[PDB]
Every structure is written in structure tokens, then in C-alpha cells.
Design an enzyme around this catalytic site. Sequence first.
Site, PDB file in Angstrom:
ATOM      1  CB  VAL A 114      -5.980  -4.298   8.124  1.00 55.63           C
ATOM      2  CG1 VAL A 114      -5.790  -4.734   9.608  1.00 55.63           C
ATOM      3  CG2 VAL A 114      -5.102  -3.356   7.700  1.00 55.63           C
ATOM      4  CD  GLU A 174      -7.700 -11.648   0.589  1.00 56.90           C
ATOM      5  OE1 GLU A 174      -7.056 -11.356  -0.699  1.00 56.90           O
ATOM      6  OE2 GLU A 174      -7.142 -12.049   1.498  1.00 56.90           O
ATOM      7  CB  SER A 175      -9.121  -4.133   0.349  1.00 59.15           C
ATOM      8  OG  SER A 175      -8.671  -4.299  -0.952  1.00 59.15           O
ATOM      9  CB  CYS A 220      -3.512   0.054   5.448  1.00 54.09           C
ATOM     10  SG  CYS A 220      -3.771  -1.170   4.380  1.00 54.09           S
ATOM     11  CE  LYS A 246       0.729  -7.942  10.681  1.00 50.44           C
ATOM     12  NZ  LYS A 246       1.007  -8.828   9.332  1.00 50.44           N
TER      13      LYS A 246
HETATM   14  C1  LIG Z   1      -2.934  -2.544   4.869  1.00 45.88           C
HETATM   15  C2  LIG Z   1      -1.491  -2.849   4.100  1.00 45.88           C
HETATM   16  C3  LIG Z   1      -0.515  -1.729   4.549  1.00 45.88           C
HETATM   17  O1  LIG Z   1      -0.546  -0.878   5.443  1.00 45.88           O
HETATM   18  N1  LIG Z   1       0.728  -1.736   3.530  1.00 45.88           N
HETATM   19  C4  LIG Z   1       1.176  -3.104   3.052  1.00 45.88           C
HETATM   20  C5  LIG Z   1       1.531  -3.100   2.063  1.00 45.88           C
HETATM   21  C6  LIG Z   1       0.814  -3.307   0.774  1.00 45.88           C
HETATM   22  C7  LIG Z   1       1.814  -3.117  -0.275  1.00 45.88           C
HETATM   23  C8  LIG Z   1       1.292  -3.209  -1.705  1.00 45.88           C
HETATM   24  N2  LIG Z   1       2.979  -3.083   0.065  1.00 45.88           N
HETATM   25  O2  LIG Z   1       2.957  -2.915   1.601  1.00 45.88           O
HETATM   26  C9  LIG Z   1       1.427  -0.681   3.688  1.00 45.88           C
HETATM   27  N3  LIG Z   1       2.531  -0.559   2.966  1.00 45.88           N
HETATM   28  C10 LIG Z   1       3.318   0.673   2.871  1.00 45.88           C
HETATM   29  C11 LIG Z   1       4.410   0.689   2.224  1.00 45.88           C
HETATM   30  C12 LIG Z   1       5.352  -0.212   2.208  1.00 45.88           C
HETATM   31  C13 LIG Z   1       6.340  -0.484   1.151  1.00 45.88           C
HETATM   32  C14 LIG Z   1       6.483   0.601   0.547  1.00 45.88           C
HETATM   33  C15 LIG Z   1       5.773   1.736   0.323  1.00 45.88           C
HETATM   34  C16 LIG Z   1       4.609   1.760   1.282  1.00 45.88           C
HETATM   35  C17 LIG Z   1       2.382   1.743   3.224  1.00 45.88           C
HETATM   36  S1  LIG Z   1       0.897   1.066   4.177  1.00 45.88           S
END
Ligand SMILES: *CCC(=O)N(Cc1cc(C)no1)c1nc(-c2ccccc2)cs1
EC number: 2.5.1.18
Lengths: 244, 244
Positions: B75, B88-89, B35, B62
Amino acid sequence: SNAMSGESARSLGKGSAPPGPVPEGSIRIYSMRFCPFAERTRLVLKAKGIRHEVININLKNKPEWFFKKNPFGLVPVLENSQGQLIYESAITCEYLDEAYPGKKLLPDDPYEKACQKMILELFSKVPSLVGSFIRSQNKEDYAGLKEEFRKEFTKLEEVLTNKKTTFFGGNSISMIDYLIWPWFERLEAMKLNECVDHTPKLKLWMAAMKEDPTVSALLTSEKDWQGFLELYLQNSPEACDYGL
Amino acid sequence: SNAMSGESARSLGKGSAPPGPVPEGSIRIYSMRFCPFAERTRLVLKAKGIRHEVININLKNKPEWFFKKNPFGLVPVLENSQGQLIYESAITCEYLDEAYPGKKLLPDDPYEKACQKMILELFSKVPSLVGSFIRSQNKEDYAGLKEEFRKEFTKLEEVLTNKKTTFFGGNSISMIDYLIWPWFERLEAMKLNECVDHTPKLKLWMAAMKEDPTVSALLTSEKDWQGFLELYLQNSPEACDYGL
Ligand SMILES: *CCC(=O)N(Cc1cc(C)no1)c1nc(-c2ccccc2)cs1
Ligand SMILES: *CCC(=O)N(Cc1cc(C)no1)c1nc(-c2ccccc2)cs1
């Protein structure tokens, strides 16, 4: 009534000349009279008693020079005498609290300040839900956005219920109340008063906010706001100066 | 290789038990190995030399107990020994820089602090562009999205130009560099390297970030990432643990 925050200043449109430099000891705010995001910054400027000038931007007939103040071309924008430029409503507010003396609106304790910004993320769906509601072109969508407002309001109600205080930051009014107040100010004007029926703490919080000297000093006509909204939806360059 | 940032902790999914209490003097980060938002927080924990434990969450399986840590179910989430929860990061990052000793990542000056948050806003479309690109199904949209990556990178290049600095907050690495690095880190893996060759300072900034000891300590396999990605888009409960 007494205009105390750029309420009578006519907005600058396409073809307007850029304003001159900011006088020393003064901070300029590029705003729009009915914008809730710019209202967060105007509320903070008054609450902290900062000397400021207000330049209103005609958001439906934007001056080309405004994109040099903010490349996103949105209000609020702060400009000091040094020509330093700060945009985004939450960044403008935090900057003001940090750079100016007077009542400290944000807690210094890192965890308590983190709680204030987490509460703001819990609020974050409300401006988009307001955007959808005003644009609803059917009685069905309209009624469903009202139930959606109750669901969001309940999440705010829970924060007050847990914290056991009148305001989102405690016993007294803080940054977080001013940051979310601009949308709650218009609920009566939007006929959304019913959406605070099962949220008693939020209803009590609204009445306490309306009594605050800063909040009260910035309140304008609901009819000016509604007339502005009609013109804004029509993409009118007369929207921003409605009632002047 | 030595895993110093949750690289070998199997993710917790539905049916697994939540972790024990947080040891005093330590802080827990609820994360996911790939992430980019939780990586912001992991970079700050390493850079400031904070004692911490990483708990990985299986985002495609989850546990319902995780919604008690963060009601958004996302997360990163920080948890301390006092039971305080921060999510919130960008909030978790500012909290750590303010609450702990070690290298200061944010500047003291209120305007320079504001600039960092404004640069964060100029970068804001990049994660959504990255999301769209990884979901591309045709040649035309794939080319169209590269043109958009180019335009957004131009906005970042203007900052490094106007500032005349190697990094976004000056001549040394600061908070802002760590907040945006997780997306640039994957450009080679997404075959988007060519999207920065029209922005000389951006390309030099990426090379400089690669050399940073904090960045290098968190480096993972380009193929582990790509394999995780294929599974993640398939909504596989085995995505988060790819490579383990
Ligand atoms: C911690 C969040 C996470 O792992 N995400 C969730 C997320 C955040 C965004 C902007 N979109 O989804 C991840 N999602 C991906 C992902 C999803 C869809 C297209 C590309 C990549 C990778 S990690
Ligand atoms: C300063 C912001 C402003 O004046 N706007 C621009 C804006 C904000 C949002 C959420 N969308 O545009 C205003 N916008 C409205 C509005 C929103 C959506 C539909 C109609 C009207 C009122 S002020």
C-alpha cells in the site's frame, strides 16, 4: 568514430581545480563515460537536442569540490548558467523534459506518466542485479544470477505483452526506454545475451533501441567498457579514463 | 472524534472479499491505518479536498487478490472508476496533484519541482533508520542509531537554512512537507524528540506541521501507534486493526 557526448574528455580527479561558471545558453552535465545512471541524462540531452558541455568525474579519486555540486558525490549532476544544481538521474531527466523545448519524452497525461514511473520501479532490481553479477567471485553464484535476470526480464516482457507495443511507452521511443536502455546496452558485453532467450518482446525492443539515432550515437567499445570494469573492481583511479 | 480518513475501516485479510466497483467521481485508496507511505497519499487526498474511499489491507494477513492491485503487494494503491491502478507512494501523490483541482501542492517551476524531489532523496535514509531503531536490542546500537538520526536531520536543517523558509518548498506547506511528515509525526512516540533539538528550523517546522489543518485532521493516538507497533513486530494478524 565521432565523439558526440563527452567521450574524449579526461576525468577530473583529487587536486583538480573547480571548473569555471557555465556559459549562458548552455547546461553542464557532471558525468563519467561508463556510468549507466549518467547515461540516462546524456541520452535525454541528445534526444531533445540541448546544447551542453560534459565534465567527467574520476569516481575512484573524487575531487573535494564535487561534493559541493552533489553532497552524495555521485554523477549525473546538471548545472545551468544560473548555478542551479540538479542531481539524481531520474530527477535530471524529468527536469530536462520539462525545462527545454523539442521532442516531449514524457507523457503529459498524469496516468500515462504514472505508468512510466511504475515501469521504472518494475525495472529497479536490474541495476542491483548487475552490481552483484560483476562482483561474483564463483561460478555457482554467477549461474544463479543469470536465472535471476530471466525472472526480472520476464516482468518487463509482460509489460510489453500487455501494452502490445514495441517500446515501453508505445509505438515510438519515450522517456522510459532511455531510462532503462543503459543496462540493456551492456548485456552482450556481460555475456548475458541468453537471459533474453524466453523474452521475445524484450529481444525485439533491444534491436529497435539499437537502431534509434540517439541510442546509436552514444554507443562505445564493449572492450573499453570491460577494461574499465576490471580497473573499477580493482578500485583504480585509471578506470574512468580507460581507452583515452 | 470524527474519522475522515479510513480510521474506522476494519482491514481486509485472507478470506475477506475484495471491495465493490469504485463509484464514478470517487477514487479508492488501498491503505493501512499506520503505514507512513500510505499516509503520504491520504494527506494529499485531504489537502486537495478529493472525494475518496479508504480500503484498509491487513499487511500481516494479505489477501492474494491484493497482488492484482499492486504486484509488489504494497500500500498505497489508488484505483479509479475506469479501473486504472497507481502504486508507489510518491507516484500516487504526484498523480493526484496533477489530475485533480483544488490546492496545488507542487510548484509550477521545473527547477523548484526538481528541488522537492531532491529533498525527498536527502530524506531517503530516515525510513530505513526508523525501521532499524524499532528493531534495536542493545544500548550501544540504540545510541549509535540516535547519532545517525542526528546526522540525517542536520542534512534537512541545512535545506531550511539555505532556503531561509519555514517549509521545505517555501513559506507555505507543499508536497514535500506532506511526503516527509509521516516519520516526524512519530518521533515523540518513539522517544526521539531530543534528536531534533540540535536542528532549530527542523523543530520549528514540526510545530508548524502540527498546526496544519490537513495534518491535524489525520492525527491518531500515540498509544494506538505504539500498540500497533508491538503487534506488527510480532507479525500478528491483529496489528493493522489495533484500536478498532
Ligand atoms: C505500508 C507499509 C507499512 O505499513 N510498513 C512496511 C515497511 C516499510 C518499511 C521501511 N519497513 O516496513 C510498516 N512497517 C513498519 C515497521 C517495520 C519494521 C520496523 C519498524 C516499523 C511499520 S508500518
Ligand atoms: C555513475 C555510477 C557509476 O559509475 N558506478 C557506481 C555504482 C553504481 C552501482 C550500482 N554501484 O556503484 C558504477 N558502478 C559500477 C559497478 C557496480 C557494482 C560493481 C562493480 C561495478 C559500474 S559503473
